[PDB]
Design a protein around this motif. Sequence first.
Motif, PDB file in Angstrom:
ATOM      1  N   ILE A 107      -6.802   5.854   0.093  1.00 46.11           N
ATOM      2  CA  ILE A 107      -7.307   4.783  -0.758  1.00 46.11           C
ATOM      3  C   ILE A 107      -6.679   3.444  -0.388  1.00 46.11           C
ATOM      4  O   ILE A 107      -7.257   2.386  -0.636  1.00 46.11           O
ATOM      5  N   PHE A 108      -5.492   3.499   0.209  1.00 47.17           N
ATOM      6  CA  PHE A 108      -4.785   2.289   0.614  1.00 47.17           C
ATOM      7  C   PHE A 108      -5.641   1.449   1.558  1.00 47.17           C
ATOM      8  O   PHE A 108      -5.530   0.224   1.588  1.00 47.17           O
ATOM      9  N   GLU A 109      -6.494   2.118   2.328  1.00 45.08           N
ATOM     10  CA  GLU A 109      -7.367   1.433   3.273  1.00 45.08           C
ATOM     11  C   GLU A 109      -8.584   0.847   2.564  1.00 45.08           C
ATOM     12  O   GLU A 109      -9.288  -0.002   3.112  1.00 45.08           O
TER      13      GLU A 109
ATOM     14  N   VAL B 275      -2.599 -15.173   6.396  1.00 42.48           N
ATOM     15  CA  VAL B 275      -2.019 -13.912   6.847  1.00 42.48           C
ATOM     16  C   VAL B 275      -1.825 -12.950   5.682  1.00 42.48           C
ATOM     17  O   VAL B 275      -1.494 -13.363   4.570  1.00 42.48           O
ATOM     18  N   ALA B 276      -2.030 -11.663   5.943  1.00 38.01           N
ATOM     19  CA  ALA B 276      -1.875 -10.639   4.917  1.00 38.01           C
ATOM     20  C   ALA B 276      -0.961  -9.517   5.395  1.00 38.01           C
ATOM     21  O   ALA B 276      -1.281  -8.809   6.351  1.00 38.01           O
ATOM     22  N   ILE B 277       0.176  -9.361   4.726  1.00 34.14           N
ATOM     23  CA  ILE B 277       1.136  -8.322   5.084  1.00 34.14           C
ATOM     24  C   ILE B 277       0.883  -7.045   4.291  1.00 34.14           C
ATOM     25  O   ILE B 277       1.193  -6.968   3.102  1.00 34.14           O
ATOM     26  N   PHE B 278       0.322  -6.043   4.959  1.00 34.82           N
ATOM     27  CA  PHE B 278       0.028  -4.766   4.318  1.00 34.82           C
ATOM     28  C   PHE B 278       1.055  -3.709   4.715  1.00 34.82           C
ATOM     29  O   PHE B 278       1.198  -3.380   5.893  1.00 34.82           O
ATOM     30  N   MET B 279       1.767  -3.182   3.724  1.00 35.60           N
ATOM     31  CA  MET B 279       2.780  -2.162   3.970  1.00 35.60           C
ATOM     32  C   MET B 279       2.168  -0.766   3.924  1.00 35.60           C
ATOM     33  O   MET B 279       1.463  -0.417   2.978  1.00 35.60           O
ATOM     34  N   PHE B 280       2.441   0.029   4.954  1.00 37.33           N
ATOM     35  CA  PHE B 280       1.916   1.388   5.031  1.00 37.33           C
ATOM     36  C   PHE B 280       3.034   2.388   5.309  1.00 37.33           C
ATOM     37  O   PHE B 280       3.792   2.237   6.266  1.00 37.33           O
ATOM     38  N   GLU B 281       3.130   3.410   4.464  1.00 30.45           N
ATOM     39  CA  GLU B 281       4.156   4.434   4.617  1.00 30.45           C
ATOM     40  C   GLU B 281       3.621   5.625   5.409  1.00 30.45           C
ATOM     41  O   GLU B 281       4.385   6.362   6.033  1.00 30.45           O
TER      42      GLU B 281
ATOM     43  N   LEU C 187       0.827  -1.201   0.000  1.00 31.98           N
ATOM     44  CA  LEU C 187       0.000   0.000   0.000  1.00 31.98           C
ATOM     45  C   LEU C 187       0.865   1.257   0.000  1.00 31.98           C
ATOM     46  O   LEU C 187       0.354   2.375  -0.064  1.00 31.98           O
ATOM     47  N   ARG C 188       2.179   1.064   0.070  1.00 28.54           N
ATOM     48  CA  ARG C 188       3.115   2.182   0.076  1.00 28.54           C
ATOM     49  C   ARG C 188       2.806   3.157  -1.057  1.00 28.54           C
ATOM     50  O   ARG C 188       2.492   4.326  -0.834  1.00 28.54           O
ATOM     51  N   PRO C 189       2.897   2.665  -2.302  1.00 25.58           N
ATOM     52  CA  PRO C 189       2.632   3.476  -3.494  1.00 25.58           C
ATOM     53  C   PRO C 189       1.155   3.831  -3.636  1.00 25.58           C
ATOM     54  O   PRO C 189       0.772   4.593  -4.526  1.00 25.58           O
TER      55      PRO C 189
ATOM     56  N   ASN D 152       5.939   4.577  13.224  1.00 24.41           N
ATOM     57  CA  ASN D 152       6.849   5.486  13.912  1.00 24.41           C
ATOM     58  C   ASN D 152       8.004   5.890  13.001  1.00 24.41           C
ATOM     59  O   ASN D 152       8.515   7.007  13.090  1.00 24.41           O
ATOM     60  N   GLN D 153       8.411   4.974  12.128  1.00 25.75           N
ATOM     61  CA  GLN D 153       9.506   5.236  11.201  1.00 25.75           C
ATOM     62  C   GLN D 153       9.069   4.996   9.760  1.00 25.75           C
ATOM     63  O   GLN D 153       7.885   5.091   9.437  1.00 25.75           O
ATOM     64  N   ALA D 154      10.032   4.688   8.898  1.00 23.05           N
ATOM     65  CA  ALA D 154       9.746   4.433   7.492  1.00 23.05           C
ATOM     66  C   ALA D 154       8.587   3.456   7.335  1.00 23.05           C
ATOM     67  O   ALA D 154       8.140   2.847   8.307  1.00 23.05           O
TER      68      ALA D 154
END
Length: 76
Positions: free
Chosen positions: A13-15, A30-36, A6-8, A64-66
């Motif tokens: 809309i990522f949600e 399991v679902a790994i969702f990346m959020f920036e 979901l980074r890009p 908290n970070q990247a």
Amino acid sequence: MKRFDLRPLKAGIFERLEELIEKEMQPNEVAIFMFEVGDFSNIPKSAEFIQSKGHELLNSLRFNQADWTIVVRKKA
């Protein structure tokens, strides 16, 4: 193919897209969702779009970070 970048997908809309992938993910996978975005409260909001009961964030997001990643377990 059990994760969603979901980074890009910027914020907002990522949600909404997290639900589009939840359909492909197994009912107990399991679902790994990346959020920036710092919006960590939205992470669980996406998995909720599926069903109020079932989506549970085990633990992985470190808002908290990247851009970080969060694991989501399906069930209902």
